[PDB]
Amino acid sequence: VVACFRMAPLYNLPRHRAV
Amino acid sequence: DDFVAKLQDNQRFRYNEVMQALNMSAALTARKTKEFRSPPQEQINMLLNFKDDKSECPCPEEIRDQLLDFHEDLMTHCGIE
């Protein structure tokens, strides 16, 4: 589950994608 | 733009504090970090669950207030209110 843990949260995404 | 900036900063801060507190609470860590483990669409879905009650939303009150004020203004502009 290392990949599931390290999978990018919302704060790592670029601003436009999160918007 | 600004709303998502604030949300991202708050989620980073909460992830940092959860990482700091996992050593005290390793058992709690699983369903504390499930939010970060969730796909980003479901993350924004959890973060947008404070329209009516539903305190399980991790979003802070100072960001909830911003979203509620903008929603009130949008409803007024649409003439719904």
Q: Which amino acid is at B31?
A: R
Instruction: Compute CA B41 distance to the chain's CA centroid, rounded to the nearest angstrom.
Output: 12
Closest-CA residue of B relative to A3 is: B37
The pair of three-digit structure tokens given for residue B69, joined into one six-digit string: 């004020």
Judged by a CB distance cut-off of 8 A, whether residue B46 touches chain A is: no
Method by which the coordinates were obtained: cryo-EM
Q: Phi, psi at residue B66, to the nearest 5°?
A: -60, -50
Radius of gyration of chain A (CA): 10
Task: Tell me the resolution in Å.
Answer: 2.6
Q: Helix or strand or coil: residue B28?
A: coil
B1 and chain A: CB distance < 8 Å anywhere? yes
How many alpha carbons lie under 13 Å from residue B13 in its C-beta half-sphere?
A: 9
